[PDB]
Amino acid sequence: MEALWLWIGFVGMLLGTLYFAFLLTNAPEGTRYFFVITATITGIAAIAYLVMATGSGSTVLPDGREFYWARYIDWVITTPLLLLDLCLLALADPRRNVTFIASLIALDVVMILTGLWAGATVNVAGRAILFIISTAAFIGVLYLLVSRLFAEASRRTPAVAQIFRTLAVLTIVLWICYPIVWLIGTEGFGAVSLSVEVFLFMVLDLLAKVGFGLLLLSSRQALSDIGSG
Ligand SMILES: CCCCCCCC/C=C/CCCCCCCCOC(=O)[C@H](O)CO
Ligand SMILES: CCCCCCCC/C=C\CCCCCCCCOC(=O)[C@H](O)CO
Ligand SMILES: *C/C=C(C)/C=C/C=C(C)/C=C/C1=C(C)CCCC1(C)C
């Protein structure tokens, strides 16, 4: 039954990508890169979901678990881009914040890639230590987001600060759910079926990408505030 959720994920990301590509044509000036980044987030996710939906995004591991690894290839590209969207909202001049941005992105890539490594690992003890390492990097991401970007965004215009805060809270809430789903799904304890796991990630993905992107790209006042500068 997981095929159903993968096809819904595909169509949802596809429709989001097409809509975001459309909104670009009326983007406030100097803001078109937001629309491009956000349509790439959903577009990459659409490709991953199509791959998994057509049966090419998973392998049966030596322990017999079916492992949807294409999921993580999506994530390793799109979660940095989501953070990038948040950085470009919050930071008035990102060219002077290379060290922070590279640090945030590197932590995020370590999180995803160590989670993929944990998921692919059959040895139960190696899987646990790798999940902890991944969660450690995740805490790094949340910390940089909360300690640095919330402060930066408070110096932006009221509309920019408002959409940043909305997207950042949305991000923190949704991203915390992903390790929980991992832990109850087949990669972790197997408390729920693979079909349930795939459904949960599909709902999270659509909210964290299409919901995120709808809120971002509809905030035309905030965008124009940034574009005008
Ligand atoms: C300036 C940057 C500094 C960064 C410092 C990082 C320090 C943290 C690293 C710790 C090493 C952890 C090794 C054990 C986990 C890997 C098991 C792997 O297990 C497996 O792959 C399977 O169990 C094999 O069957
Ligand atoms: C919005 C970002 C992009 C998201 C993806 C949307 C575009 C999807 C494009 C094509 C779908 C059909 C693919 C056919 C491939 C044929 C290769 C060879 O095929 C075959 O071998 C035959 O199936 C025979 O079995
Ligand atoms: C569009 C996709 C998104 C926003 C995916 C987010 C994924 C995560 C925040 C993943 C977190 C993980 C851990 C913190 C521990 C190991 C397992 C992961 C990779 C699910």
Instruction: Looking at the chain, list the stretches that DSSP marks H as alpha helix, in order from N- to C-terminal side.
Output: 2-23, 32-53, 70-90, 98-120, 124-144, 150-153, 158-184, 194-205, 212-217, 220-228
The pocket around ligand 3, CB under 6 angstroms, is made up of 75, 78-79, 111-112, 115, 118, 131, 134-135, 138, 175, 178-179, 182, 205, 208-209
Identify the burial level of 124 via C-beta atoms within 10 angstroms of its C-beta, where 0-12 means exposed, 13-18 middle and 19 or more buried. Answer: exposed
**Structural domain that includes position 111:** 1-229
Angle, in degrees to the nearest 10, between helices 158-184 and 70-90: 160
Provide the CB-side half-sphere exposure for 163 (13 A, CA).
26
Query: Which token pair is 14?
Result: 């596809």
Q: How far apart are CA 36 and CA 218, in angstroms?
A: 14
Experimental resolution (Å): 1.8
Q: For the chain, what is the radius of gyration of the CA atoms?
A: 18
DSSP 121-165: --SHHHHHHHHHHHHHHHHHHHHHIIIIIHHHHTTS-HHHHHHHH
Ligand 3 mutation target, pool 138, 173, 184, 186, most atoms within 8 A of CB: 138
Write down the experimental method used for this entry.
X-ray
Total domain count for the chain?
Answer: 1
Q: Using a 6 Å cutoff on CB, does residue 121 contact ligand 1? A: yes
Burial of 10 (0-12, 13-18, 19+ CB in 10 A): buried
Taking the CA of residue 46 as reference, the ligand 2 atom at the shortest distance is 4
**Cα separation of 165 and 87, whole Å?**
12
Q: Which residues pair with 161 in a beta bridge?
A: none
Residues forming beta bridges with residue 60, ordered by sequence position: 66
Of 6, 50, 52, the residue with max ligand 2 atoms within 8 A of its CB, to mutate for a pocket test, comes to 50
Find tokens 């948040």 and name the residue.
86
Count the Cβ atoms, other than its own, within 10 Å of residue 80: 20
CATH code at 54?
Answer: 1.20.1070.10
Counting beta carbons within 10 angstroms of the beta carbon of residue 204, is it exposed (0 to 12), middle (13 to 18) or buried (19 or more)? middle
